[PDB]
């Protein structure tokens, strides 16, 4: 139950050790269809991974809940819920019931929330200018691929500034969304060749005669939902002419369009959108403001959209549709053009941007996230506070309080394994550093030179979000007690 059930989790607990840390690594997973997925995020792997033991699915769904809601630093807390079940092995011989186990972690969890507010520093009230965004990207790189931290620094910060409704004074949590920023996969080119376009880019190849003019502008978008043969020639010629009379440069049609209708559209050079997906169709409704009209006819300006200009260029060698606004008011519109060699590196940067953009959305939603030491720095002072918390209120629950502090020792144990450092040497170094203000700006140093000394987090700028830290403990503790609260594993009939 708890046993074999926890031992089965220890197999994935030791396998996911490389999923976190600046020295962390990725893994290879194969589904039933043969598709390979190489990524360092365990939330994506466990989603497609077939789970046998029933209670393990609860642990998987608990970690996926943090990815949907928070999605920031989930790799660091991914194994946090696994160690909570490991420290319960010592409580087996002691004879502590699951009631005292839940009460021990619940009382220590609420005490931890009060300690995070006392040690929090660096309140950020801006959340707008890119200088505050560059400091938020560094901790994202600490939990992700360490290859290049310079490229993603200017790539993500520039895209957030474009989608941000920059104005004279923007208060009251200006609107920000993850779906507002899309990453376009372009095969070929170095990672440093990735640019940022303030508009929206579509993936498709036009028939020809691409628009060669820019400064002229004046572009519009229209979104749409023997005698018998001679009649179709007059009707199509009339319907295509009435649309061109309104100056419609681009037509969005979800239904089928024959080659005869596309012939008259080539007279004025009218491009058509062949993407059946509703993501690109509904996005233009919030920007250009076009209402889908099932009939063709002569769409009124109420159903017609407004786009800056249309230009087709070859990025990775193929023609793609790129809508870019050179000069003008731009709000809630932006995109990221990603240049990569193989799809293996494209998915790694995709998860970096998806969690990077979600980190900004998760930061702006609360009043503030401030700053908290990350990369296992905060958990060092927590052990000292929890140790004194158990001796503060002696009793039967004090033994469970000590096990709750040992559960935080897996984070420094994991960081030493990814970097090859000896945990036996590093543990007293951190025990002699943060323990007896010099402990607020100090953190553990992970590098080949860490044997000489331990550098602080001030120059490294490695931090953690206070909003996600409070919610990560709440989910990990509740999920751990939920597995322990399961009485028995019984199948279901029919």
């Amino acid at each position: 139950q708890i046993i074999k059930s926890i031992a089965a989790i220890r197999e994935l607990h030791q396998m996911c050790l490389t999923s976190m840390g600046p020295c962390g690594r990725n893994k290879i997973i194969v589904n039933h269809l043969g598709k390979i997925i190489i990524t360092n995020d365990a939330a994506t792997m466990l989603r497609e991974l077939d789970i046998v033991h029933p209670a393990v699915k609860v642990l998987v769904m608990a970690t996926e809940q943090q990815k949907i809601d928070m999605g920031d630093g989930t790799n660091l807390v991914m194994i946090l819920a696994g160690e909570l079940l490991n420290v319960s092995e010592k409580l087996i011989s002691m004879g502590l019931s699951a009631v005292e186990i839940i009460q021990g972690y619940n009382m220590a969890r609420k005490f931890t929330l009060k300690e995070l507010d006392e040690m929090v520093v660096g309140e950020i009230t801006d959340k707008n200018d890119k200088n505050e965004l560059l400091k938020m990207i560094k901790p994202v790189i600490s939990s992700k691929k360490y290859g290049s931290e310079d490229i993603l620094s200017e790539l993500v910060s520039e895209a957030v500034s474009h989608v941000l409704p920059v104005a004279q004074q923007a208060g009251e949590i200006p609107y920000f969304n993850v779906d507002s920023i899309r990453v376009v996969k372009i095969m070929g080119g170095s990672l440093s060749n990735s640019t940022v376009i303030k508009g929206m880019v579509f993936n498709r190849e036009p028939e020809g005669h691409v628009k060669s003019l820019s400064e002229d502008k004046k572009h519009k978008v229209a979104v749409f939902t023997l005698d018998f043969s001679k009649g179709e020639e007059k009707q199509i010629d009339a319907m295509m002419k009435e649309i061109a009379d309104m100056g419609v440069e681009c037509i969005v049609a979800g239904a089928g369009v024959g080659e005869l209708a596309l012939h008259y559209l080539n007279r004025y050079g009218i491009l058509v959108l062949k993407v059946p997906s509703k993501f690109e169709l509904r996005r233009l409704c919030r920007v250009c403001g076009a209402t889908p009209l099932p009939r063709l006819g002569a769409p009124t300006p109420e159903e017609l959209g407004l786009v800056e200009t249309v230009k087709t260029m070859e990025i990775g060698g193929d023609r793609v549709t790129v809508f870019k606004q050179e000069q003008g008011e731009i709000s809630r519109t932006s995109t990221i053009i990603l240049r990569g060699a193989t799809q293996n590196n494209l998915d790694d940067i995709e998860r970096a941007i998806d969690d990077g953009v979600a980190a900004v959305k998760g930061l702006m939603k609360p009043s503030g996230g401030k700053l908290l030491p990350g990369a296992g720095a905060t958990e060092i002072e927590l052990i000292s506070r929890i140790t004194k918390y158990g001796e503060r209120t002696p009793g039967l629950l004090q033994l469970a309080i000590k096990q709750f502090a040992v559960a935080f020792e897996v984070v420094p144990r994991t960081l030493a394994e990814t970097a090859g450092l000896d945990v036996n040497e590093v543990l007293p170094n951190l025990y002699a550093a943060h323990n007896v203000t010099d402990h607020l700006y100090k953190g553990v140093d992970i590098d080949g030179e860490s044997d000489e000394g331990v550098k602080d987090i001030r120059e490294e700028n490695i931090y953690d979000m206070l909003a996600t830290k409070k919610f990560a403990i709440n989910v990990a503790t509740e999920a751990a007690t939920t597995v322990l609260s399961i009485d028995q594993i019984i199948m279901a009939k029919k």
Partner: protein, 505 residues
Amino acid sequence: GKGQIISNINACVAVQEALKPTLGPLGSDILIVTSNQKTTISNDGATILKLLDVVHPAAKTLVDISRAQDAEVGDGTTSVTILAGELMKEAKPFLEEGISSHLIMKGYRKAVSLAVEKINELAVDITSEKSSGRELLERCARTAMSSKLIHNNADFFVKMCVDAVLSLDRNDLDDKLIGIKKIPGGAMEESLFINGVAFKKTFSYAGFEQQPKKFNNPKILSLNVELELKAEKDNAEVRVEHVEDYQAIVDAEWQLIFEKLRQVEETGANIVLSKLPIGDLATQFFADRNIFCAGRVSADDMNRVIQAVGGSIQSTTSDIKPEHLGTCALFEEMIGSERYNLFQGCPQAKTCTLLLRGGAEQVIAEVERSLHDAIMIVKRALQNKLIVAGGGATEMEVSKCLRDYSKTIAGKQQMIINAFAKALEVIPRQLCENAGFDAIEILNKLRLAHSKGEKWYGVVFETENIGDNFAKFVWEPALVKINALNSATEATNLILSVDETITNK
């Protein structure tokens, strides 16, 4: 763990052992066996790894190397691709040892970073000699003949490959722009260059030899719908009262076709090109006008027609414009009772067409790979002119300077950099097994070459001794050698970053 990576590297090295006889002109072709009984025998790794059955999922990385080889570089699949995984061979004993590959990935990354500065340092600038596109590209064309089966007869291909790329616009160079027509049978010296759009293969139906092959100035015409009587026409609902009403459908379909062909006839085009095939109804109608007609035009052919005459697909006669009617200076039909359309006098055409002819279908398949690899050499040479000796001997002199930076390490990465320089000695070792030369005799003089001559040490294969390939007029673009380590960096770091694999079902 580390034991699983050893079994993963041995599976990748297993195919690399068969791919050793590729780099260099002395390499030997490799035979493959597929399930379709149709195989391609070539030194190219992109074709072999694509048809090779993959067992372990990490072995698919070698397939992605060839895909990234053509996208980032465009050539070197017989040279750079086989060397992308050689760093894992020297790192095999490091896996059994307690050495963590995290520092090994940083060791090779810092080694290839300092090697790029060494490649640009030894790069010779030919612009001081005022070398035009003749002497510069001819010496680079003979270098591209390495790994190719054709050697003694490659002199005819040098004149064809250089003259074909110079006719193409040097501002935009792409393999998709220029056409390649592979014609089985015949001889290799019968290959010629085409100055205009050519048809895919050929169309032979009804009268064939009766069409004269000598024309003056034909005109290109574009069509869309297919022409035929009561066969390929669009189905419609027609009320039929009696059997005699079927004659009205024949007249209604013919008059619909006749009025469209009569209105477009005012253009006076001698060449009729339709998107679909052409039937006998239009054949006899065009026979009275004594004009040529060819259907079944591929989408790749129409894109090149727009670049020359500026035509467009016409589904109806109302949109016909005088600007869509072009012409040509001379038209001659070229083999095995198959007509080949050949256009000339198209200065505005931004695309080219090359006619390839050969007896063996497997040999001409590598010639297509030779054309794609030669264009990438010319493209990177015209953009930046740099002289780098080929044959894999460039890293020989570089390995000496790499050992100098290792002495300044004084750390765990010191022996890691020495393993990177040791991995460079695998290149001449694989070349000695191909030519039967003694590997020890070459490696002994290899370490003694950088102590005296330095500069460029090429290991000339023609004299069966040691020499310099710089005086042999063997030139290679530097961008291929610079990006060669970048392709091996992402390939080595990816496998070392996977300590375990997961396979469901």
